[PDB]
A and B are shown apart, each in its own frame.
Chain A
Amino acid sequence: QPMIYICGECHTENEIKSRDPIRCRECGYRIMYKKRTKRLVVFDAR
């Protein structure tokens, strides 16, 4: 349910729901990026 996006301009942690427009809540920039996943990221060092 709670989804976080990162604004492309001001780099703000943005809690928004679904079906509401992609709109930064304090600078109005309309491009946001997903945060890095919380799953296990393991690489061999080759």
Chain B
Amino acid sequence: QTVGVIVRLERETFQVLNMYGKVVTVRHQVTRKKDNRFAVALDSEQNNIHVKDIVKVIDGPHSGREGEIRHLFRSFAFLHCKKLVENGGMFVCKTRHLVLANELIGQTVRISQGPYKGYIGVVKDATESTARVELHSTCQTISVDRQRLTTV
């Protein structure tokens, strides 16, 4: 449920600064999560910010500093300052306190409507509207609208 960024490489532990402002000390065996490089965050001016953007701190316990965006959360942003000497420049600030400087898959279905009516198939892939049905009787996989499919 919690993400983090390591600030110092040690022999048997990881020094990671999470969204606390406090550096924790954990073992090697943390897991890896896919970073959202296309995530969108909002500052106090409701302006869109993304990765590698310089933002200023105007509120919070550390107002006045300036940081660069590395990773994003729902209400937090990771900051870097090369002049800041604590924990290798890693820090965290809240997003609003800154300013810019299917279940159908694998199920057997019946096409109950249309030209392929009566054909029995297994859904290989599906969306909100269409579904890829692997027909039992033919060698074809066809795209069927999900309003024409009945799960059997």
Closest chain B residue to A42, Cβ basis:
B120
What mask results when residues 90 to 110 of chain B are scored 1 for a CB within 8 Å of chain A, else 0? 000000000000000000100
Closest chain A residue to B109, Cβ basis:
A40
Does A19 have its Cβ within 8 Å of any Cβ on chain B?
no
Does A44 have its Cβ within 8 Å of any Cβ on chain B?
yes
Taking a contact as CB atoms under 8 Å apart, the answer to whether B108 and A44 are in contact is: no
Q: Identify whether the interface residues of B are mostly helix, strand, loop, or mixed.
A: loop
Taking a contact as CB atoms under 8 Å apart, the answer to whether A43 and B152 are in contact is: no
Q: Which residues of A contact B118 (CB under 8 A)?
A: 44
Number of residues of chain B lying within 8 A (CB) of chain A: 8
Does B76 have its Cβ within 8 Å of any Cβ on chain A?
no
Taking a contact as CB atoms under 8 Å apart, the answer to whether B108 and A39 are in contact is: yes
Closest chain A residue to B108, Cβ basis:
A40
Closest chain B residue to A43, Cβ basis:
B137
Closest chain A residue to B122, Cβ basis:
A39
What mask results when residues 11 to 46 of chain A are scored 1 for a CB within 8 Å of chain B, else 0? 000000000000000000000000000011111101
Q: Which residues of A contact B108 (CB under 8 A)?
A: 39-40
Residues of chain B whose beta carbon lies under 8 Å from any beta carbon of chain A = 108, 118-120, 136-138, 152
A to B CB contacts below 8 Å, 17 in the list? A39-B108, A40-B108, A40-B120, A40-B136, A40-B152, A41-B136, A42-B119, A42-B120, A42-B136, A42-B137, A43-B136, A43-B137, A44-B118, A44-B119, A44-B137, A44-B138, A46-B137
